[PDB]
Amino acid sequence: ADKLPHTKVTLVAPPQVHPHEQATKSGPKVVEFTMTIEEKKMVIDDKGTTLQAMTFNGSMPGPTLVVHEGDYVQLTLVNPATNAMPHNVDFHGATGALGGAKLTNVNPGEQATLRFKADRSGTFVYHCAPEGMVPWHVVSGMSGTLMVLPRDGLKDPQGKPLHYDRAYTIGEFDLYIPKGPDGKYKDYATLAESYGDTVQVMRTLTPSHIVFNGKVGALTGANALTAKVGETVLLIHSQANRDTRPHLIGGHGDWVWETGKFANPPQRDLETWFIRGGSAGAALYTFKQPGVYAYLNHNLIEAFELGAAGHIKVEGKWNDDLMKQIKAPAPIP
Amino acid sequence: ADKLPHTKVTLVAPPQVHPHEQATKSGPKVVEFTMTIEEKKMVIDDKGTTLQAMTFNGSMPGPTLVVHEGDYVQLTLVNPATNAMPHNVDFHGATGALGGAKLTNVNPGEQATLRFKADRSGTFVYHCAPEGMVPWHVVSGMSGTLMVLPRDGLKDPQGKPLHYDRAYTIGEFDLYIPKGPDGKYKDYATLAESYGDTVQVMRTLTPSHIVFNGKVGALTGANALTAKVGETVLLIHSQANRDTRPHLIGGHGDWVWETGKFANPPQRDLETWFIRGGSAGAALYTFKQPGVYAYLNHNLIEAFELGAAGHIKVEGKWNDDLMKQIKAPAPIP
Amino acid sequence: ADKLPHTKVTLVAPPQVHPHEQATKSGPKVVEFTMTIEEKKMVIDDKGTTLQAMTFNGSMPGPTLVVHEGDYVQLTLVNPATNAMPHNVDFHGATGALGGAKLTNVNPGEQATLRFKADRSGTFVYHCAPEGMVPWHVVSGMSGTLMVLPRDGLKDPQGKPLHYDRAYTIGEFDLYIPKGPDGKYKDYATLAESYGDTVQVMRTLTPSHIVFNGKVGALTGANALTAKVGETVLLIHSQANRDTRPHLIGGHGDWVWETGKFANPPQRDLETWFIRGGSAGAALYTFKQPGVYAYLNHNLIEAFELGAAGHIKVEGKWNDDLMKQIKAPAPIP
Ligand SMILES: [Cu+2]
Ligand SMILES: [Cu+2]
Ligand SMILES: [Cu+2]
Ligand SMILES: [Cu+2]
Ligand SMILES: [Cu+2]
Ligand SMILES: [Cu+2]
Ligand SMILES: [Zn+2]
Ligand SMILES: [Zn+2]
Ligand SMILES: [Zn+2]
């Protein structure tokens, strides 16, 4: 690793993913990243409910980091003195020392640099895991995805090449917002004051909200995902704490790695797939119809009542072969 | 599609599935179906609890529709003036327009005809999805399965032929029946009056009942499924809203497509498989022993306490090679 | 089976597994086991909460039974007169008579001997299932694993040999301990007195505790699992009632059969896998780094708050290629 060239990557905010190659002629590199932790109060729904949140780089999820199999990830993790809590990082893509958590314990005002070999292909969760407060830091927003691409790109079960034209990253967050005796959600002045009441809600195993990318409706309206007929999209879906079941309404998972590990053959033609709590999965889809799709957790209560749903707006020409309204709604003859 | 022959299929009520070919020499057809929505109050347990239910064709689940890959499904959906609500249909097997929901919005007194290409093999959920009330219509009973068989029939991982001699269809329904201050389940005069209280229960993510085919014990006694030693059964299991884990007590899943898509290789020898909320899965089993089996969700609380269990009564000759009582229960020597 | 040699196996307590061969030159045998049921009050957490427990052989889980495909399992099940309840056993690995439950109904003071053919390879749950009280006996602790190894040992997707150097067995138990009006957990004088209150908690679908091998912290401290760099461990994980998502913190599932059936190809490089309620799964991992790992259910609330987490202490030499602390935590420059 000490023999290798270094490259520095500039991260981009979800739902985008930073520029990268799929199949590459390049040899292994030490790939350098930096992230800065930000604790902040965030508004998470349409009625002004707040979360005392904790983030990598100011977003939920943290940004997606992309490397190739055989690369080394070298992350500088910064915990500004403006934060109240200690933090660290655990990479599921890494081997040893609790995913790196033991080597990256940063108090406010400190930083650390971790290197690990990305020797396994796939999408992998990374998350904060400070001893004694792991689930709180995770459910408060401290997770994201590391994608390790095979050096020769994605492959189907027969070893044929697969690709995406655009990648989107979706972090799904089960939130545990406490209520007061009046039945309204509690607003806390500081992160520390949210703790005890939040642990109590967590222990019920019942989320108050389940959101994509930090808020009900985050991936809707002006902020809907976009694509065009004929384009192949990769949808990366991470859930660091709780199971989810992604579904594209009006579409499919053409090729899906629901356990998120690219050396395994993908499944095809899925209606709904399953992302295990503590993992990231990946689905390819090539659009064949224009229109607005929903991308959601298909526990429909979790999607429509609790917030786990987004939109994809797709341009292009309608295909009557695939679907046709033979008779529009009309009175029964 | 406009060049093709049409065929009309008469649907049958669950747990049966309408007559169809597996492997077929026939070419693609436009396959015509009709379903009529029925809102009705249904008794769902042994103690007289009622559900303000919503159904395709008067049953939970709706009937299973069977076509072959490359066929076109052409469904006439009828919403009689006797119903109170608007409805539509979203086929997970279809491509575009939110699965067809956008093209089939029928007010009471109206009907519509949708065509789509069944270009992907597998078992696929279909369900109602009226804008603004999706989870309510789904959990109240509006879902069923479309099975798209490969034109050359089912195949094992090595591409060898597989078949079933009899097919059964099981829809599992997580129900959310509200209670009054007295702790008894509420009975509502109309469908609309159940709504607000039901949404509140839904948001707890805790079903009051979880039933196969519309009621606790639906598939038991006179209504148990049946088979014989040597017969291969296909068990289609749909759950449009919540995860389940089917298990045949005393048997196995010989070949299982738990994600329900036939172009993927099945798994063999399963004890328990997993049907993701928002999907239908399929399992083959060849009976080797006579007797009464249970087919259930193997969260045993969900099965035995909440209602997610049925029976299969199997005729034939006992096999002592497979299992033998060496010593019957007797006092400890 | 009446032509075959018999062997008698002495069972060992979890988390160990009794001595056995993987690949074997031996032909099929009748393999004889005995287990004795023990009802007992057990302390399940650090604050003195008790469970009115029910066990195979005095442990949660029951011991793991290991045979080879084509062997016959012959179990003598003993229910001492000191117990209060009737019991039986249902082997998911068996064919017929509700897994053997119908043939092994033993009142206190009785015993029975069941034989069945272990004709399917994999890890399979076994559990008590007395008519009318199935979920109670299961959640109170009456489950364990039968492992049926292929006669030629484990194989990867390409049919290459796989092995483990050490096997550990982990039973995960969702517990349903009732509380009194004071908010403290109830302590019951007898097993029968726990029943009604426990059924009420069960019906909420919310466990009070979720534990590995009978107690919070069971597999920690003096009782942590152990291994060494270069050693391959098999981690058998059973959950007879509820879904779980195992994860090795700082490691991976090198080869995983999450549905637990060895005739299916395993998946590689998993971060987190999924064990369906009512099943046992198996994961291989070869250690590459020394240190203390956590092995946990990656619903981190379930792990850290409710008890579903253990430790593995690993000896050997640190590998800087795999992971290196480039800069230890230090003030931000
Ligand atoms: Cu943190
Ligand atoms: Cu983790
Ligand atoms: Cu409807
Ligand atoms: Cu749907
Ligand atoms: Cu028992
Ligand atoms: Cu069972
Ligand atoms: Zn493309
Ligand atoms: Zn047959
Ligand atoms: Zn070894």
TrEMBL record, chains A, B, C:
Asked whether the UniProt record includes Repeat among its keywords, one would answer yes
Q: Where in the cell is it found?
A: Periplasm
Q: Where does Zn(2+) 3 bind?
A: 68, 71
Residues where Cu(+) binds: 87, 128, 137, 142
Binding-site residues for Cu cation, renumbered to this chain: 87, 92, 127-128, 137, 142, 298
Tell me the residue numbers annotated for binding Zn(2+) 4: 87, 128
Residues noted as binding Zn(2+) 7 in the record, renumbered to the chain: 193
Under which main EC class is this enzyme filed? oxidoreductase
**Biological process annotations from GO:** denitrification pathway; nitrate assimilation
Binding of Zn(2+) 5: at which residues? 90, 92, 127, 298
Gene Ontology molecular function, alphabetical: copper ion binding; nitrite reductase (NO-forming) activity
Residues recorded as binding Zn(2+) 2, renumbered to this chain, are 32
Which InterPro entries does its entry note? Cu-oxidase-like_N, Cu-oxidase_2nd, Cu-oxidase_fam, Cupredoxin, NO2-reductase_Cu
Keywords of the record, alphabetical order, are: Copper, FAD, Flavoprotein, Metal-binding, Nitrate assimilation, Oxidoreductase, Periplasm, Pyrrolidone carboxylic acid, Repeat, Signal, Zinc
User: Which amino acids does the record list as binding Cu(2+) 2?
Assistant: 90, 92, 127, 298
Known EC number: 1.7.2.1
Question: So where does Zn(2+) 8 get bound?
Answer: 305
Q: Which residues make up the binding site for Cu(2+) 1? A: 87, 128, 137, 142
PANTHER family (alphabetical): FI03373P-RELATED, MULTI-COPPER OXIDASE
Q: What is the official name of this protein in its record? A: Copper-containing nitrite reductase
Upper taxonomic lineage: Bacteria, Pseudomonadati, Pseudomonadota, Betaproteobacteria, Burkholderiales
